[PDB]
Design a binder for this molecule. Structure first.
Ligand SMILES: NC[C@H]1O[C@H](O[C@H]2[C@H](O)[C@@H](O[C@H]3O[C@H](CO)[C@@H](O)[C@H](N)[C@H]3O)[C@H](N)C[C@@H]2N)[C@H](N)C[C@@H]1O
Ligand SMILES: NC[C@H]1O[C@H](O[C@H]2[C@H](O)[C@@H](O[C@H]3O[C@H](CO)[C@@H](O)[C@H](N)[C@H]3O)[C@H](N)C[C@@H]2N)[C@H](N)C[C@@H]1O
Ligand SMILES: NC[C@H]1O[C@H](O[C@H]2[C@H](O)[C@@H](O[C@H]3O[C@H](CO)[C@@H](O)[C@H](N)[C@H]3O)[C@H](N)C[C@@H]2N)[C@H](N)C[C@@H]1O
Ligand SMILES: [Cl-]
Ligand SMILES: [Cl-]
Ligand SMILES: [Cl-]
Lengths: 276, 273, 274
């Protein structure tokens, strides 16, 4: 019943008949994910024969200081286990939340993926690890608690859950669409997005540090403050829609390199793609 | 007395602890008064499974063996001092009511003597923080400078700290009482030097910085925290404080679930008249 | 690049054996390779330097009755605590940190990213404080890891605009930030490494404050964004504090002026300018 690890998705694509070399104190969840593969505790490693798996980020710090690590490419030959939110060169799943290329995030939103709060996360999105995404409890009852249900019997729970499924303010993200976090998004430190009231973080939206987001963010909007407010937009409204049609975040690696000057210069991006 | 110890004193029932995960020195110290082993084949009739990390419990509950293990009754996580429980428990020496949970920041607050008790059915976000102020009336704001103080220098340092009316390090003030039916959001902050109570039913929004007492059933948001609304009318707040549903038995909670679900039904039933 | 533990063992081990309290990690064994270590059992400070692997391991040790004879730093230390205070000036990565100054893992990462030039003495930084920089905001994209798809030539142009940018994305083309002495920083506080270069001596950053520019010495900043609430002392006292620099005193001098450090009024009647 174990969900598919981020490590499992990498090994499925890059192990290539090698043996996994565990770098660090192995854990029960790691051993569980490493069952269908040949693995051993790492000593002397070779990218021809071994794929290095550092258990903790502390273990990766140790591996990347070692001389043997210089022959190992990120993702292609090594990876960290305890980093479910780490970026990848391909489109992955987090639990069952699709996550695009070069998109990383922390543990608060990994849990938000587990809670069914997020529908999907786009490409090239940078989310600070300390960002958090939680829902609201019911606000229309005599109690605000959630774990009182542990004391509810079958009859008391049927009538509790029935009201939640009808609450139009979506407690615990009920009866609402899971939120989509677009591509080219930046989320600052200590940011919070209410999962009960937000369904869309637009493409290109920039959420400032310490911002509390209670509503949808328009595409390429910059929001700051408690509560978050639109301070500026990244580009004009004509480039905003042109961006939403050109969709550079879905290019190939060869196309990204072939349009580097357009990605580096928004003015040149317009002179190249803003055809009418 | 650790949280695992309080459960094992209650629900182990002569079984043997099954350690799901790599054991730590502190867990090995707590499991000393019982027999234990590394979990392989587990049966809830023979074993109480104890997951070391939250990552261990996730692996255990996804195993086909956990299908007959009940929460707290048959299993528990050791590195979850702030996890909820079906009976009133102690966090260090801070009482905590039933179905109430918090994070490690609040755990350290309990350890620092900042909290007097935490009520029933209270939901505290793990990223919530509770710290006190340093001394602000002296030439230095540092605390660890006292590590360079000798026996005579700290006699006068500690002397003025306890005289300080602003309660540096929560000095000369009652510890903080967090009521029942309380909700506190993520990244919230409560100042242990200037806050003595969070009322019953109080709701602290995410990202809110609480510097003064929150009234019962008040909804506070912002930096600093300010009251945005009250949960119920004044009359229901009076009756909610006389009834105290959070102290009901499991029986009364299930019997009056209709009153717990609808505030208006609660009002006619337990209201004054 | 010595660790916090390596710095302490080179100075206080004194021919003893390090006794490891807890399950040893890969990075701890590597730090302990030049020393004589073994699993802790029965420990004596005349014989052993107890090393606790995790914060959770040290709590277990100090509750044990064998810890009653050990002293902090001199006789025991925690491994996973690069931001923990020390009774001497230390090096976090390659960032000088003053005596009795502590921070959390976010600021340790800020030292690793080169965002911090130095951190003063007797500075108290909450563990949930953060110091991150801005990505480029004058481009078509805000991503950083998109550069993992950049080839050799595209990387050149990208890195070129970054060093040209006057707003200092990723703290480029700007001086690393200085954090003064006798500074306090509340929980959940954030300092932008792209636009800040100095946290003045004696500054106080209140909880939840978003500091977007330099904080003067002895100013108290709060809010989102952070603005000056008050100053700890008068303008004349700040100027005397900046010349006296009590945070550079010897342990003897600190005790000899414990009355001047406790009462600001006594500090001025003794060090105030003529
Ligand atoms: N190191 C400096 C960089 O840090 C961040 O990016 C980096 C992220 O912080 C990294 O995040 C990793 O570390 C963070 C915690 O710091 C974890 O939350 C996250 N899941 C884990 O993947 C991620 N793996 C790589 C990415 N380029 C900043 N957004 C940009 C900055 O230049
Ligand atoms: N999983 C989704 C739910 O998460 C929270 O509740 C849950 C709490 O977050 C849980 O708390 C546990 O997990 C949290 C988060 O990591 C820890 O901070 C906490 N110390 C630990 O005890 C607790 N054990 C169960 C409770 N239902 C939300 N308040 C409600 C939400 O529906
Ligand atoms: N316990 C109560 C005290 O907490 C803090 O200080 C304490 C610091 O928070 C401690 O910092 C340690 O604990 C913190 C918090 O977990 C970690 O962020 C930090 N890396 C770790 O070194 C440090 N080792 C000791 C110092 N007296 C307050 N600043 C003062 C308060 O009286
Ligand atoms: Cl629920
Ligand atoms: Cl103290
Ligand atoms: Cl870069």
């Amino acid at each position: 019943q174990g969900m598919k690890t981020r490590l499992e998705q990498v090994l499925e694509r890059y192990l290539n008949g090698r043996e996994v070399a565990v770098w660090g104190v192995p854990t029960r969840r790691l051993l569980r994910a490493l069952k269908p593969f040949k693995f051993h505790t790492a000593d002397r490693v070779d990218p021809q024969y071994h794929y290095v798996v550092a258990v903790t980020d502390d273990d990766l710090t140790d591996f990347l200081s070692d001389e043997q690590s210089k022959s190992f490419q990120y993702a292609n030959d090594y990876l960290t286990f305890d980093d479910e939110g780490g970026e990848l060169p391909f489109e992955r799943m987090c639990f069952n939340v699709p996550v695009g290329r070069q998109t990383y995030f922390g543990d608060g939103v990994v849990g938000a993926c587990e809670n069914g709060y997020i529908k999907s996360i786009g490409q090239f999105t940078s989310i600070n690890g300390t960002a958090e995404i939680h829902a609201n409890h019911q606000l229309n009852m005599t109690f605000v608690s959630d774990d009182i249900q542990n004391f509810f019997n079958e009859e008391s729970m049927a009538v509790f859950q029935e009201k939640l499924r009808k609450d139009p303010k979506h407690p615990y993200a009920y009866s609402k669409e899971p939120m989509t976090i677009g591509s080219d998004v930046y989320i600052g430190a200590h940011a919070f997005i209410n999962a009960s009231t937000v369904t869309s973080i637009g493409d290109g939206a920039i959420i400032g540090s310490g911002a509390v987001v209670l509503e949808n963010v328009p595409p390429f909007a910059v929001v700051v403050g408690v509560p978050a407010r639109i301070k500026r937009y990244r580009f004009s409204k004509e480039m905003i829609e042109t961006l939403l049609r050109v969709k550079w975040w879905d290019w190939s690696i060869e196309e990204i390199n072939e349009n580097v000057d357009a990605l580096i210069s928004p003015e040149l991006f317009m002179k190249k793609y803003g055809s009418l």
